[PDB]
Amino acid sequence: TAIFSDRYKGQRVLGKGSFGEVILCKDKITGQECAVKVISKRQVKQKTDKESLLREVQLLKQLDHPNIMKLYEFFEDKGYFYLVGEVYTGGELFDEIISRKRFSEVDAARIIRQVLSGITYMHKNKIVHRDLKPENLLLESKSKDANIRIIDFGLSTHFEASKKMKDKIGTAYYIAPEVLHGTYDEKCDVWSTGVILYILLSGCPPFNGANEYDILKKVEKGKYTFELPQWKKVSESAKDLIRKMLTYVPSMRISARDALDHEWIQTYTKVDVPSLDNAILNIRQFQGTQKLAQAALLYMGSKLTSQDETKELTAIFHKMDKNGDGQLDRAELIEGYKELMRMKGQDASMLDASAVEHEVDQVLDAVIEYSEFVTVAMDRKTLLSRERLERAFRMFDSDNSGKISSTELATIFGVSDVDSETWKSVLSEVDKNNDGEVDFDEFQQMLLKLCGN
Ligand SMILES: Nc1ncnc2c1c(Oc1cccc(Cl)c1)nn2CC1CCNCC1
Ligand SMILES: [Ca+2]
């Protein structure tokens, strides 16, 4: 009954999350800022009925814990769901960890106590996460003492997971084996936390592989070891907790509540404690790899979307061109730009007609010839993905060599799920005399060829 766009105005894009885009919105009356997740009904299938989702939303809005994202409102229209809640500005936990100079078991214990405290509270209220991963751990604010906030508790119960690799990066490392076979309960979140803890103390995923399916095979077998040099400096109580959290049979696995009472959490959140330097280095490399694979898939996705929309907007304006002089008025360009989103679905950044008019005004200030309007309007859509790709390449290239080796390409394309023979074939066409490494432009050329260009 209540309309989302009548209450809130979209201010900035916050980024892509599970099931949808996240937008920084502001209440038009009170000035309250909020983070809004927009879920497209045509792209995301519902697992439950309308009344089951309404009942969970009503419960989720009443729950309150300092390590759980606060939900404020919920809206639904013909084609979307709008989940409105509190905005957190500290970024992803792992992006803050790689910025600091030192990281010890005290820092890892304080992180995991917060995550376990939030999970314990949500399990007492019969809510399961299922998709707990570092990307769902946000820091409340930019301060070094900020609490961790878990986002997306309870959503996996009501929305089906995306099958596209651009939406599944990192997910295979943390998923509990019982989730893969279909019988699972709240203990799956203890397993996921166990994996995160293993990565915080060693910087290496316990279940790894050269591609998504190889990771899932290791997860399904459930076997892992503490046979890496970096585990020698870690306490025995930490390894005991990980062992209890990564116990295969969920009825034998420790509960979130009992993981809080574990000796490791009690000792390290209240006796020599060195900095886990090799772990930080490995987390920094792991984070850079995941972000570059993700940036590569989103670059290819936005390039295909841009090609689709460039051609559709050209056809719309060509039909609207009454005399065929290649030119149109501002009012006509709004009509055609609105027509594009009416058929291709509403864009998260274009919440209502007023947002569409402002986007058209920004393009008209740079450039009337409708072909020029199309080019500038579509380059603005890809801007973020192109600069994210170059920035992620530069971050991955930690020695500033300007190049990425074939072994690094194999790792990146493995995480991106691009077949080995497919990317090597593309590399041969970009540079016929390739010498086992590519610069940024050659890498970008490879991605353009990997999406039909
Ligand atoms: N609370 C937040 N504050 C700031 N940004 C948020 C979020 C967030 O979690 C949401 C935001 C709105 C609704 C729901 Cl159900 C979850 N998702 N995002 C988007 C981020 C999530 C982490 N990677 C970058 C994009
Ligand atoms: Ca390099």
Where residue 42 sits, what CATH number does that domain have?
A: 3.30.200.20
Between strands 33-40 and 71-76, the pairing is: unpaired
Structural domain boundaries enclosing 185: 90-152+161-285
Instruction: Report how far ligand 1's centroid is from the alpha carbon of 17 (Å).
Output: 6
* Domain closes at, from 285, 308, 343: 285
Inter-CA distances, 398 with 125, 166, 285, 393, 404, Å:
44, 24, 9, 9, 10
300 and 449 housed in the same domain: yes
Same domain? For 108 and 64 the reply is no
Catalytic residue among 131, 152, 167, 189: 131
Mutation choice for ligand 1 from 135, 138, 159, 171, CB with most ligand atoms inside 8 A: 138
Pocket test for ligand 1, best of 22, 26, 133 (most atoms within 8 A of CB): 22
Same domain? For 296 and 199 the reply is no
Mapping DSSP onto H, E and C, the string for the chain reads: CCCHHHHEEEEEEEEEECCEEEEEEEECCCCCEEEEEEEECCCCCECCCHHHHHHHHHHHHHCCCCCECCEEEEEECCCEEEEEECCCCCCEHHHHHCCCCCCCHHHHHHHHHHHHHHHHHHHHCCCCCCCCCHHHEEECCCCCCCCEEECCCCCCCCECCCCCHHHHCCHHHHCCHHHHHCCCCCCHHHHHHHHHHHHHHHCCCCCCCCCHHHHHHHHHHCCCCCCCHHHCCCCHHHHHHHHHHCCCCCCCCCCHHHHHCCHHHHHHCCCCCCCCHHHHHHHHHHHHHHHHHHHHHHHHHHHHHHHHHHHHHHHHHHHHCCCCCCECCHHHHHHHHHHHHHHHCCCCCCCCHHHHHHHHHHHHHHCCEHHHHHHHHHHHHHHHHHHHHHHHHHHHCCCCCCEEEHHHHHHHHHHHCCCHHHHHHHHHHHCCCCCCEEEHHHHHHHHHHCCCC
For atom 21 of ligand 1, which residue has the closest CA? 17
Whether residues 240 and 347 fall in one domain = no
Ligand 1, closest atom to CA 152? 15
- Distance from Cα 86 to the centre of ligand 2, integer Å: 39
Same domain assignment for residues 299 and 444: yes
Spatial distance between the Cα atoms of 393 and 162, rounded to a whole number of angstroms: 26
Cα(214) to centroid of ligand 1, in Å? 29
CATH number assigned to the domain comprising residue 220: 1.10.510.10
Query: Which of the listed residues 285, 317, 343 is the one where a domain comes to its end?
Result: 285
Task: List binding-site positions for Ca(2+).
Answer: 321, 323, 325, 327, 332, 369, 372, 397, 399, 401, 403, 408, 431, 433, 435, 437, 442
Q: Are residues 364 and 297 in the same domain?
A: yes
The two tokens of residue 43 are: 């792209």
Asked about 64 being catalytic, the answer comes back as no
Same domain? For 204 and 254 the reply is yes
Q: Which residues pair with 82 in a beta bridge?
A: 38, 75
Q: In this structure, are strands 20-27 and 148-150 parallel, antiparallel, or unpaired?
A: unpaired
If one counts the domains in the chain, the total is 3
- Residue ending a domain, among 106, 133, 160, is 160
Neighbours of 348 (CB within 10 A): 22
Identify whether residues 262 and 367 lie together within a single domain. Answer: no
The protein residue with its alpha carbon nearest to ligand 1, atom 22, reads 135
Q: Tell whether 52 and 200 lie within a shared domain.
A: no
Closest CA to 265 of 252, 274, 256, 275: 256
* Residues 297 and 405 both lie in one domain: yes
Residue pair 25/9 in contact (Cβ under 8 Å)? The answer is: yes
C-alpha 158/C-alpha 83 separation (Å) is 13
Show the ligand 1 pocket: residues with CB < 6 angstroms: 14-15, 17, 22, 35-37, 69, 83, 85-88, 92, 135, 138, 151-152
**Domain co-membership, 307 together with 174:** no
Query: Do 233 and 324 reside in the same domain of the chain?
Result: no
